[PDB]
Enzyme design. Structure first.
Site, short mmCIF file in Angstrom:
data_model
loop_
_atom_site.label_atom_id
_atom_site.label_comp_id
_atom_site.label_asym_id
_atom_site.label_seq_id
_atom_site.Cartn_x
_atom_site.Cartn_y
_atom_site.Cartn_z
CG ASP G 39 -2.27 0.76 0.97
OD1 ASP G 39 -2.18 1.56 0.00
OD2 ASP G 39 -3.25 0.76 1.78
P1 LIG Z 1 -2.49 5.32 0.06
O1 LIG Z 1 -3.43 5.62 -0.78
O2 LIG Z 1 -2.98 3.85 1.11
O3 LIG Z 1 -2.36 6.46 1.32
C1 LIG Z 1 -1.92 6.37 2.84
C2 LIG Z 1 -2.54 7.33 3.45
C3 LIG Z 1 -2.32 7.50 4.99
C4 LIG Z 1 -2.01 8.59 2.91
C5 LIG Z 1 -4.09 7.47 3.44
O4 LIG Z 1 -4.62 6.89 2.37
C6 LIG Z 1 -5.06 8.87 3.78
O5 LIG Z 1 -5.23 9.72 2.79
N1 LIG Z 1 -5.69 8.90 4.85
C7 LIG Z 1 -5.81 10.32 5.55
C8 LIG Z 1 -4.70 10.64 6.13
C9 LIG Z 1 -3.91 10.01 7.16
O6 LIG Z 1 -3.76 8.78 7.26
N2 LIG Z 1 -3.78 10.78 8.31
C10 LIG Z 1 -3.31 12.18 8.33
C11 LIG Z 1 -1.83 12.47 8.32
S1 LIG Z 1 -1.21 13.24 9.84
C12 LIG Z 1 -1.06 11.77 11.06
O7 LIG Z 1 -1.51 10.70 10.71
C13 LIG Z 1 -0.26 12.09 12.19
C14 LIG Z 1 0.21 10.79 12.87
C15 LIG Z 1 0.89 11.14 14.17
C16 LIG Z 1 2.22 12.05 14.22
C17 LIG Z 1 3.25 11.33 13.16
C18 LIG Z 1 3.54 10.01 13.59
C19 LIG Z 1 4.85 10.30 14.52
C20 LIG Z 1 4.73 10.10 15.81
C21 LIG Z 1 5.98 10.13 16.41
C22 LIG Z 1 6.95 9.01 16.37
C23 LIG Z 1 8.05 8.87 17.53
C24 LIG Z 1 8.45 10.04 18.09
C25 LIG Z 1 9.43 9.82 19.18
#
Ligand SMILES: *P(=O)(O)OCC(C)(C)[C@H](O)C(=O)NCCC(=O)NCCSC(=O)CCCCCCCCCCCCC
Ligand SMILES: CCCCCCCCCCCCCCCCCC(=O)OC[C@H](COP(=O)([O-])OCC[N+](C)(C)C)OC(=O)CCCCCCCCCCCCCCCCC
Ligand SMILES: CCCCCCCCCCCCCCCCCC(=O)OC[C@H](COP(=O)([O-])OCC[N+](C)(C)C)OC(=O)CCCCCCCCCCCCCCCCC
Ligand SMILES: CCCCCCCCCCCCCCCCCC(=O)OC[C@H](COP(=O)(O)OCCN)OC(=O)CCCCCCCCCCCCCCCCC
Ligand SMILES: CCCCCCCCCCCCCCCCCC(=O)OC[C@H](COP(=O)(O)OCCN)OC(=O)CCCCCCCCCCCCCCCCC
Ligand SMILES: NC(=O)C1=CN([C@@H]2O[C@H](COP(=O)(O)OP(=O)(O)OC[C@H]3O[C@@H](n4cnc5c(N)ncnc54)[C@H](OP(=O)(O)O)[C@@H]3O)[C@@H](O)[C@H]2O)C=CC1
Ligand code: SF4
Ligand code: SF4
Ligand code: SF4
Lengths: 334, 185, 153, 441, 49, 337, 82, 115
Positions: G39
């Protein structure tokens, strides 16, 4: 001679080191009690009667306090720098005349000996600060290096003006030469300049940049604890007294007065100490009066104010000597 | 910036003075520069401080001054007969700004409205005096005592047994402070 | 026993006479703390000088509210303070969170973070109340058995 | 809200309404010396956006455990050698949720919170909260309270300036003036501890007047102190004003222009240092200020030295105001004479029924403040201190927001400091007079 | 404090709350004392939540 | 595991589980808790709201323990082994008594026999005297009354004394322990440990101290562990040479040792221990253990009987040895070789 | 570099990835999504893994273009690092 | 004005779903690229595979969002959490608070007390 060479050497060293290390302990209490009086305080008055055991509690407390060797620190150097600074600061007391020739070494070149020993001890500060591998100690050590690029030429220039009058480079001969007049009268600008450089040389305030507490936390000595910190404190306060002695040697007639040998030898010792104690007061008075200068401004002050004036005296002073027929004979006399 | 209306009279600064317009003599200007004159004045001012009486007091043999209104540790007080003055109204529990007071009451064996629990968390208290301000009967007071530092925090959780004992010990000052400060309340 | 007490005496007398707290302070209790360094109480007259570095400090006085954003920094500088070391908790906030006890960002007492040797009451404790707690800690040093402790094991 | 789910019209942004400068009269690429090549991107080869995200300047955590931090500031400095390229102050290390805690308090119960914001200026913080509630209460506090609040308002101003100016001199390296001035403030906390029962957190100034009346010996002792405080100002004036090391550590340091100082939300000396005549006690007179004469110190170069000269003048102007208050102190009550707002005298509460009911309700329920909101601002010793209080019509505030002068000042730190040396940052922290009880709240 | 985006803002990040903090404490539905608290842990030798 | 615990004397304990403010309902006494293991059992009991009595000797070395629990939870009692009253005052409010008192080397007032046999005797006799539910005594690995090493013999006789007095004793035999402040990994990374009698070739199954504190916590809740004997050892067998190899790979230092013949080193080691006041790591018997090898005595319960699977020492070398990496190699990732 | 060299290492990495449907489907012209069952996030991990192995940085603009093994091979040859 | 910090990104709205689609991939890529650099900054004793697993799961919890204005709040939070992590403003306890290293049945929950 009458008794052993080794015993005479033994007791003379003791009579120099032990009273000086006692004198160093009291300058630390005396500064704390002097600023307090200027600050409407008392200063130490509860560790011993009138506070006269305070330095010993501080000393004893640290020798029983845990040493830490930081993981990021180059440890052999982390210990080598304070040991170098202490040994090479205390060596400077080996050429002080406490009377005519009453020195552990009446060397013919004791002024150059003092420049070599002071310069080598500042290299310990540089090394210890760098070795810590912590930001503030790193910034502290770089300031100490900037500071020696500031005051070393100033002192060496200043002293060369005293040697032109004395003609000797021996500490007793310079003092003997001042039986004509103290060198603070004809060399008054040099005395101010040499005193200013001595304050910068000792990293004392207003030039406490390497160990500034309001800008760095402790500067070069921030990772240093227990005995390592105590090595750096005895070096600094022993340097203050030594520079006050040397200023008294070169401008204030040294031991010159302002059983029978014992009574006379005492007067020389008191006279040197009285003049040294006055200059020790001027240091403490100076730390209490002024703000800290900025390290850029100290470098510019020594390099565009002090040295240009000192080079012009280096020209002017021998021109006055040849003109008045007063070049000193450079033979052994006094 | 400046107020609306006519601009302030003479708000515009005069034109800058040149180097040869400064009306200071060279002998004075150069003398002040080389003689470090202004800083010798500062050195001297420290000297006359050196010959002035110090301000220092010798604590604990000498104590600094505190007023009748001073707010120290809490004490529960009694009437001249030894009856508790506290009646469990709970006003101080309500007004507390830090919720340091916990009170439980009942009718006592003789039918009297008295507290069964009376706790002050001395590590939650803010020492504002609002609780003694609100008391209808002058029960909760703050003593003039500030020296009660302890080895543990459990020693700072006062129950009714500790607070009555405080009033039983400190009553002569608590009465003298209320006497001296009552008309202003 | 006589000689091992005498070493304990001379050891504790030094710890008492050279009592250096870190120059660390979080809020308004630090105002009363720095009033111990000023002429009325002259904390130096007893041998108490505030050192900036935790490497040259004997005692940490927690004079202020400990937030969750600061707790890692209070703990880090406490660990970096060499033995023997002591902690004075000054004020209701450092004792049990004080007036901010029911806040979302406040540690409910510094002794959730570091061990605490003496607790001073008040918000703020008066300059003299803090001096009284420092006199408790020195009285605890003076009764601390160091060399006679080893002699028992 | 619902439309935001899918793509719709983009919300307009300041970048959109940007306008091109006219080329006929435009002169220079930088009319400000703050951005004149003393920031980041003045060295290296490539910018730190691409291929530069892998390297760092020398970054040092200036605080919290730092003397010049004066407390609880984490000022992340990026140094080019010994020069500051970027300053990122990190605050919130004394954030304790004061503004949320005020919402679970009555209006009386929230007043001690204001003692602990700028915690060298307690009675002034109390006043701005007492003047906002009094405005929403639509009451007029009596003349004796207004003169007590202005006199203790200027005793507080002197107390703040003693801590502020002499802490600032201590950072630059001058130790002795700090010790002298802390005997004077130690003198002035007796006046606090004599009218209230606290040296620091008085809880004295309250909506409706003041808690108690001053004791019968206080005015004479304040006047006795006043006859010698001029000499105190002059001897600290004697170590710093002409000192050449003091002048070269502050003159030309932390320079902010008049037009930028307003745009930076600067108030107080931070604003008056830049040449603007502005005093909140002159422009919106509160309490008894419009009944006294005082001058307003205004600088011309907008640097640390002018700000120092303006604050040392306010010592003399505060002592001038205090004398007039001692002279003009009227008789009468110190609490608004309405027991539905202010607590009745203990005598009346123990003697009369309507006094007991009112005492009982004021300490359990509190008084109700008529619904509405207000912004109230006063000339705090550190600048325009303001409060935005929203009222439900009930006995607990719906919203208490504190506008702290030092919050607005620490934000302009990188603007005025980038390009100076590490010691000059220490100089600018003290001239900007920060207490992090108000910064974080 | 409230969770309001400001489009166009350069460097929009937390200024008051702890670093890893989650939630907007001036919201009315946010509880007064929050959801988490910290302590130093003896077994892990660190601050834990 | 449940909200109700019922003890051997039959008292019920209605518990509220989480946090330091809750009710763990258990009153424990942990003798020898100021050592290395003792903090992990005390933190585990205290942070779940249990009252823990901590008998101590030196006041300043007990202080890290109070942070573990809430107010009134951790109670310090000052005791001595030869002060029976202070022992009895410390176990008489308790439903579990942990005996973690041991010493590797003899002292001028305690032999290995005096601290192990007699110390256990007083502690167990008080456990019997006040009828305390549970008694988890911690012995050592290789404990044997027929042993010749003073350590393995004396801790083997105290095992039998405890059972003879209080038969429901949970006897726990851990292997050599590693962890933070362990005398296993931190000595191999140190510079004082230069002398050695064998070529660091003795083998044992090292066990995480964190998993041993967890094991002692689970024995309190699994009542069926009473009267049992537990050997708590790690997943692999190593020599001192294999462990020291891991340490060098982690600290990047390549430590070295001076080997001595045992008839030569052992007499010296008995002199250093008798002439220095601090724990020197060197003593006549510690040299004798140095030549001995670990045997996991069967018919003894294991970590699996607590439902626990210990982790290997290799996974923990980076966490605990990183303070000892030189600055040049400090920023590097864990070895994971 | 060599084309066969910069392809052999990809097959080992791609087969080494945990949850591809089957290791046989990897060819020189195979698609991550249609064939290898990866994916969006799995594909971003695969370009990330490829960049780490070749010790090169793949920029955002051309990182998206790599949806098939052949595109990875052409980019690896195009970028001058190994 | 004051300089934005090293990883400071201006807050802008997503133009369309294609914009949001490309930004989310850019954010996920930037996180997993930085996992080796997080490990040595914070002295993580776990391997980088675990760190990237946690990044994946954080992104997966917002997988099924079909609202541009919810995604942009989410793209804001990750930008600030990335900037906060890379500049080393947070410390090890915060990063380890992020790694956690409820009853699985009714009957299990019932027998222990609720959970
Ligand atoms: P493909 O067509 O399958 O595309 C996959 C995605 C994910 C783009 C989806 O199809 C999609 O468009 N869905 C909606 C968007 C989404 O999934 N989320 C919005 C993005 S912001 C987000 O998800 C933030 C997550 C938390 C912060 C980042 C992660 C890391 C956190 C800290 C890590 C470790 C630190 C110590
Ligand atoms: C080396 C000495 C060089 C001589 C120049 C300095 C002389 C004064 C320093 C020694 C002070 C004498 C000790 C003292 O203060 O007595 C008070 C002490 C009392 O201890 P104290 O320090 O708590 O003093 C208490 C009084 N207040 C609190 C007000 C300060 O008396 C003793 O301890 C008995 C003497 C034991 C020490 C003897 C050796 C002293 C060093 C050698 C001399
Ligand atoms: C260098 C030498 C340092 C000075 C000698 C130590 C002074 C000393 O120990 O006196 C403390 C002791 C007592 O100190 P202390 O431990 O009771 O502390 C005093 C308590 N305060 C601080 C509150 C005042 O003095 C004596 O009573 C004499 C016994 C010491 C024996 C020294 C023999 C040499
Ligand atoms: C004896 C009695 C006194 C005993 C006590 C001595 C004082 C002890 C004080 C503490 C140590 C001294 C501290 C020095 C502080 C002065 C300083 O360093 O400031 C630097 C300052 C910067 O100067 P700059 O910027 O270049 O020029 C414009 C300045 N507004 O530079 C200056 O301001 C200039 C400082 C001048 C010092 C030079 C030495 C003066 C001696 C005379 C020099 C002779 C040559 C000149 C001949 C006279 C010509 C008319
Ligand atoms: C000073 C007065 C004399 C000092 C104490 C002398 C009395 C004494 O018992 O000395 C013997 C001492 C015993 O040391 P110990 O603790 O029993 O050994 C275990 C450490 N591995 O061993 C020692 O020698 C300690 C070193 C001194
Ligand atoms: N750690 C290991 O590798 C192994 C440990 N064990 C056993 O596990 C137990 C715990 O191990 P660990 O914590 O590492 O050991 P430590 O040596 O670190 O701790 C032993 C404890 O016993 C106390 N103690 C010792 N002698 C006496 C005495 N005479 N009187 C009173 N108290 C005394 C100590 O108190 P104080 O600090 O006050 O002296 C300390 O709290 C010990 O019994 C040990 O023998 C067995 C096998 C391996
Ligand atoms: S207000 Fe006073 S009388 Fe009433 S319950 Fe409280 S302490 Fe008792
Ligand atoms: S003085 Fe203390 S107990 Fe009384 S109301 Fe204030 S905080 Fe509560
Ligand atoms: S205890 Fe009181 S004075 Fe001290 S920091 Fe807290 S609120 Fe301020």
């Amino acid at each position: 001679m009458s008794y052993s060479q080794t015993i005479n050497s033994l007791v003379e060293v003791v009579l120099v080191l032990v009273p000086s290390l006692v004198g160093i302990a009291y300058v630390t209490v005396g500064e704390r009690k002097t600023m307090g009086s200027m600050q409407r305080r008392l200063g130490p008055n509860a560790v011993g009667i009138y506070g006269l055991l305070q330095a010993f509690a501080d000393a004893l407390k640290l020798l029983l306090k845990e040493y830490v060797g930081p993981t990021q620190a180059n440890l052999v150097l982390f210990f080598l720098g304070p040991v170098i600074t202490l040994i090479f600061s205390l060596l400077g007391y080996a050429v002080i005349p406490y009377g005519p020739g009453l020195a552990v070494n009446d060397l013919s070149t004791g002024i150059l000996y003092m420049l070599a020993v002071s310069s080598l001890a500042t290299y310990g500060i540089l090394l210890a600060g760098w070795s810590a591998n912590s930001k503030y100690a790193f910034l502290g050590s770089l300031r100490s290096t900037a500071q020696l690029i500031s005051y070393e030429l100033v002192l060496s220039s200043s002293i060369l003006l005293v040697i032109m009058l004395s003609g000797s480079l021996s500490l007793t001969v310079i003092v003997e030469s001042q039986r004509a007049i103290w060198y603070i009268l004809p060399l008054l600008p040099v005395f101010i300049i040499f005193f200013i450089g001595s304050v910068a040389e000792t990293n004392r305030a207003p030039f406490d940049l390497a160990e500034a507490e309001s800008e760095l936390v402790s500067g070069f000595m921030t990772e240093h604890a227990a005995v390592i910190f105590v090595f750096f404190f005895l070096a600094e306060y022993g340097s203050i007294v030594l520079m006050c002695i040397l200023t008294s040697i070169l401008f204030l007639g040294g031991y010159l007065l302002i059983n029978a040998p014992t009574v006379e030898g005492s007067f020389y010792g008191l006279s040197l100490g009285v003049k040294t104690s006055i200059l020790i007061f001027v240091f403490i008075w100076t730390r209490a009066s002024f703000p800290r200068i900025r390290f850029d401004q100290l470098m510019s002050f020594c390099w565009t104010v002090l040295l240009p004036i000192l080079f012009a005296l280096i020209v002017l002073v021998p021109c006055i000597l040849y003109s008045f027929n007063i070049f000193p004979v450079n033979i052994s006399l006094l | 910036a400046t107020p609306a209306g006519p601009p302030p009279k003479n708000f515009r600064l005069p034109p800058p003075k040149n180097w040869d317009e400064e009306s200071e003599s060279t002998i004075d200007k150069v003398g002040k520069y080389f003689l470090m004159t202004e800083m010798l004045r500062g050195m001297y001012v420290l000297l006359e401080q050196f010959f002035r009486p110090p301000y220092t007091i010798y604590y604990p043999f000498e104590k600094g001054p505190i007023s009748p209104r001073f707010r120290g540790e809490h004490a529960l007080r009694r009437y001249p007969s030894g009856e508790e003055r506290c009646i469990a109204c709970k006003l101080c529990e309500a007004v507390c700004p830090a919720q340091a007071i916990t009170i439980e009451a009942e009718e006592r064996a003789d039918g009297s409205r008295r507290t069964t629990r009376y706790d002050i968390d001395m590590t939650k208290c803010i020492y504002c005096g609002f609780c003694q301000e609100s008391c209808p009967v002058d029960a909760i007071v703050e003593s003039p005592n500030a020296e009660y530092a302890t080895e543990t925090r459990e020693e700072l959780l006062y129950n009714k047994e500790k607070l009555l004992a405080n009033g039983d010990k400190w009553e002569p000052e608590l009465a003298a402070a209320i006497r001296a400060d009552a008309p202003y309340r | 026993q006589y000689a091992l007490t005498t070493l304990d005496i001379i050891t504790n007398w030094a710890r008492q006479g050279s009592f250096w707290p870190m120059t660390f302070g979080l809020a308004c209790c630090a105002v009363e703390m720095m009033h111990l360094s000023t002429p009325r109480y002259d904390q130096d007259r007893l041998g108490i000088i505030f050192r900036a570095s935790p490497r040259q400090s004997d005692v940490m006085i927690v004079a202020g509210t400990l937030t969750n954003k600061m707790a890692p920094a209070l703990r880090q500088v406490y660990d970096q303070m060499p033995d023997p070391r002591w902690v004075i908790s000054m004020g209701s906030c450092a004792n049990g969170g004080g007036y901010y006890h029911y806040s979302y960002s406040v540690v409910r007492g510094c002794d959730r973070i570091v061990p605490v040797d003496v607790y001073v009451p008040g918000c703020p404790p008066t300059s003299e109340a803090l001096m009284y707690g420092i006199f408790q800690l020195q009285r605890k040093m003076r009764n601390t058995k160091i060399t006679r402790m080893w002699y028992r094991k | 809200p619902q439309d935001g789910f899918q793509g719709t019209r983009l919300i307009p942004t300041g970048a959109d309404f940007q306008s091109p400068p006219d080329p006929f009269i435009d002169e220079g690429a930088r009319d400000n010396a703050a951005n004149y090549g003393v920031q980041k991107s003045r060295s290296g080869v490539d910018e730190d956006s691409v291929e530069g995200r892998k390297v760092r300047h020398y970054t040092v955590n200036f605080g919290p455990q730092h003397p010049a931090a004066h407390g609880v500031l984490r000022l992340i400095l990026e140094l080019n050698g010994e020069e500051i390229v970027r300053a990122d102050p990190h605050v919130g290390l004394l954030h304790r949720g004061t503004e949320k805690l005020c919402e679970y308090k009555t209006y009386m119960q929230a007043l001690p919170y204001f003692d602990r914001l700028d915690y060298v200026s307690m009675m002034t913080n109390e006043q701005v909260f007492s003047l906002a509630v009094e405005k929403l209460l639509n009451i007029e506090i009596p003349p004796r309270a207004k003169f007590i609040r202005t006199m203790f308002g200027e005793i507080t101003r002197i107390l703040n300036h003693l801590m502020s100016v002499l802490s600032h001199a201590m950072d630059v390296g001058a130790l002795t003036p700090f010790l002298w001035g802390f005997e004077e403030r130690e003198k002035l906390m007796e006046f606090y501890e004599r009218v209230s029962g606290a040296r620091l957190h008085a809880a004295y100034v309250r909506p409706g007047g003041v808690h108690q009346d001053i004791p019968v010996g206080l005015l004479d002792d304040i006047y006795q102190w006043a006859t010698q405080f001029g000499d105190r100002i002059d001897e600290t004036e004697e170590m710093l004003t002409d000192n050449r090391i003091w002048i070269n550590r502050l003159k030309g340091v932390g320079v902010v222009s008049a037009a930028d100082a307003l745009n930076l939300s600067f108030t107080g000396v931070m604003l008056r240092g830049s040449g603007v005549p502005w005093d909140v006690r002159k422009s919106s007179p509160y309490d008894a200020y419009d009944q006294v004469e005082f001058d307003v110190p205004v600088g011309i170069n907008g640097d640390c030295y002018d700000r120092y000269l303006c604050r040392m003048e306010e010592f003399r102007q505060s002592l001038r105001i205090i004398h007039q208050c001692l002279n003009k102190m009227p008789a009468g009550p110190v609490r608004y004479e309405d027991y539905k707002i202010t607590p009745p005298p203990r005598a009346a509460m123990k003697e009369n029924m309507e006094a007991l009911i009112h005492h009982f309700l004021l300490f359990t329920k509190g008084y109700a403040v008529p619904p509405g909101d207000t912004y109230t601002a006063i000339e705090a010793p550190k600048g325009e201190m303001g409060v935005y209080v929203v009222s439900d019509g009930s006995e607990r505030p719906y919203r208490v927001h504190i506008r702290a002068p030092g919050f607005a000042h620490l934000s302009g730190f990188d603007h005025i400091t980038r390009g100076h040396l590490l010691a000059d940052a220490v100089a600018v922290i003290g001239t900007m007079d920060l207490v992090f009880g108000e910064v974080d709240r | 404090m409230f969770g309001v985006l400001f489009v166009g803002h350069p460097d929009l990040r937390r200024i008051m709350t702890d670093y890893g903090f989650e939630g907007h404490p001036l919201r009315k539905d946010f509880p007064l004392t929050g959801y988490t608290e910290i302590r130093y842990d003896e077994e892990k030798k660190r601050i834990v939540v | 595991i449940s909200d109700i615990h019922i003890t051997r004397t039959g008292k019920p304990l209605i518990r509220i589980q989480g946090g330091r403010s809750s009710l763990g309902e258990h009153t424990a006494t942990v003798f020898g808790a100021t050592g290395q293991l003792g903090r992990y059992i005390v933190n585990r009991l205290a942070r779940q709201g249990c009252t823990v009595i901590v008998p101590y000797r030196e006041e300043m070395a007990k202080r890290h323990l109070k942070v573990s629990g809430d107010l009134g939870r951790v109670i310090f009692m000052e005791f001595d082994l030869r002060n029976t009253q202070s022992i009895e005052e410390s176990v008489r409010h308790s439903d579990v008594v942990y005996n973690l008192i041991g010493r590797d080397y003899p002292t001028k007032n305690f032999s290995l026999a005096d601290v192990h046999i007699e110390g256990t005797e007083r502690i167990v006799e008080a456990v019997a005297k006040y009828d305390v539910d549970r008694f988890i005594q911690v012995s050592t690995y290789n404990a044997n009354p027929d042993s010749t090493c003073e350590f393995f013999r004396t801790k083997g006789i105290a095992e039998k004394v405890a059972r003879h007095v209080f038969p429901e004793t949970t006897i726990v035999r851990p292997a050599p322990m590693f962890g933070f402040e362990d005398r296993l990994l931190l000595k191999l990374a140190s510079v004082t440990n230069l002398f050695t009698s064998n070529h660091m070739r003795e083998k044992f199954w090292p066990v995480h101290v964190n998993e041993v504190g967890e094991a002692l916590e689970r024995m309190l809740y699994d009542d069926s562990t009473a009267g049992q004997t537990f050997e708590l050892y790690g997943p692999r067998q190593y020599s001192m040479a294999q462990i020291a190899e891991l340490v060098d790979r982690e600290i990047y230092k390549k430590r070295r040792h001076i080997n001595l013949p045992k008839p030569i080193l052992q007499p010296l080691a008995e002199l250093i221990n008798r002439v220095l006041w601090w724990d020197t790591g060197l003593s006549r018997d510690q040299v004798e253990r140095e030549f001995h090898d670990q045997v996991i005595d069967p018919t003894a319960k294991t970590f699996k009987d607590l439902g626990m699977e210990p982790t290997d020492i290799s996974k923990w070398t980076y966490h605990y040895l990183l303070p000892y990496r030189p600055s040049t190699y400090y920023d590097l990732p864990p070895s994971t070789e | 570099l060599q084309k066969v060299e910069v392809y052999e290492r990809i097959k080992s990495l791609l087969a080494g990835f945990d949850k591809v449907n089957d290791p046989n489907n990897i060819t020189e012209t195979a698609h991550f999504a249609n064939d290898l069952g990866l994916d969006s996030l799995d594909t971003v991990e695969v370009v990330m893994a490829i960049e780490e192995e070749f010790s090169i940085e793949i920029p955002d603009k051309d990182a998206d273009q790599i949806h098939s093994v052949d595109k990875a091979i052409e980019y690896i040859l195009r970028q001058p690092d190994a | 004005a004051v300089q934005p910090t090293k990883f400071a990104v201006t807050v802008r709205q997503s133009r369309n779903w294609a914009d949001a689609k490309q930004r989310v991939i850019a954010a996920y890529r930037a996180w997993i690229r930085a996992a080796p650099e997080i490990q040595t900054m914070y002295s993580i004793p776990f391997p980088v595979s675990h760190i990237r697993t946690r990044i994946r799961q954080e992104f997966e919890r917002h997988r099924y969002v079909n609202k541009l204005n919810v995604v942009d709040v989410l793209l804001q939070q990750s930008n600030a959490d990335f900037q906060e992590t890379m500049n080393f403003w947070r410390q090890q306890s915060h990063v380890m608070a992020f790694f956690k290293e409820l009853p699985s049945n009714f009957i299990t929950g019932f027998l222990e007390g609720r959970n």
